[PDB]
Copies of this chain bind each other. A is one copy, B any other.
Amino acid sequence: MITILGAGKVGMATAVMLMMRGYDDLLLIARTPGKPQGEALDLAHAAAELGVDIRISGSNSYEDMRGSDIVLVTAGIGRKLEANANTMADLAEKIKAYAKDAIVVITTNPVDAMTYVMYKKTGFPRERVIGFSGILDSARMAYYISQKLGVSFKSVNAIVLGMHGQKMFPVPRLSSVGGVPLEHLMSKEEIEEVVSETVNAGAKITELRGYSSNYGPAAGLVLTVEAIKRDSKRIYPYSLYLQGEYGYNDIVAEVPAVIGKSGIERIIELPLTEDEKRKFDEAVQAVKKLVETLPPQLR
């Protein structure tokens, strides 16, 4: 079974989407008394109409996550923040006691920072501590390009690196549409426009609807689950703890990686030019900051 820690917006979006697919039984766990139990019941009535025979339940007891293959961490607090470090630190001791051999993917922001804290507090191998960054930035870039060029996003190959935030930088030179290089379809202006929209997409929604993304991370978690369950050997960009890769270590960054039934198998090093290594270094430093703002205890 797949456990979900959160029972909030992004947690329920994930639950809804995972019930639709029916990959496994799912468990909802949240601190607020009766909250997860109540949502599991409504979610169970939905599965009953859709005919999805998976078991769906909720609990306030963290020890119920005992025996989980994947533990999706979405329990952070949204936009309207690094107070999410404490909840990561508090959740870090629970899965360390009841899910020591599970893969954990963090949907809390700042994810690169949060992934750093979860990794250190769980004492889990880097391959089983996954931060959800790339898949979303990539799709968003696909979406803006497509809207502008008038083509499906299924035909856009968008490469991105850095971290999940202000300093996230897409790599056009390696992106294309239906085979055609991106830089050959759009002028430098048009490319810098799609990159603003992509970088500022998350803030924009918040600005519009009133609260930060939840369907995006949710739909990205579905892919991640499906990728682990099939032992697929897929390459997706995630926020992972670096140990030499891209020249850095003792830090977290958004990079391409092959995920499997046992987690991250290896980090891929894209061939970058001086500029792109400049821009990747800016990102590493950006994450540098957020971690330094954290109190030593959480480090």
A136 within 8 A of B: yes
Number of interface residues of A (CB under 8 A): 81
- Cβ of A174 < 8 Å from any Cβ of B? yes
Within 8 Å of chain B (Cβ to Cβ): is A16?
A: yes
Docked CA distance A115–B214 (Å): 32
Q: Which residues of B contact A151 (CB under 8 A)?
A: 233-235, 258
B42 touches A213 (CB 8 A): yes
Which of A116-124, A199-207, A282-290 sits within the interface?
A: A199-207
Given known pairs A210-B38, A258-B151, the reply for A45 and B178 (CB within 8 Å) is no
Partner of A216, one of B46, B139, B175: B46
> Known contacts being A204-B38, A208-B38, is A152 close to B232, with CB within 8 Å?
yes
Which residues on A are within 8 Å of B, measured CB to CB?
A: 13, 16-17, 20-22, 34-39, 41-51, 53-54, 135-136, 139-140, 142-143, 146, 150-155, 157, 159, 171, 174-181, 184, 201, 204-210, 213-216, 218-220, 222-223, 226-227, 230, 232-237, 256, 258, 268, 270-271
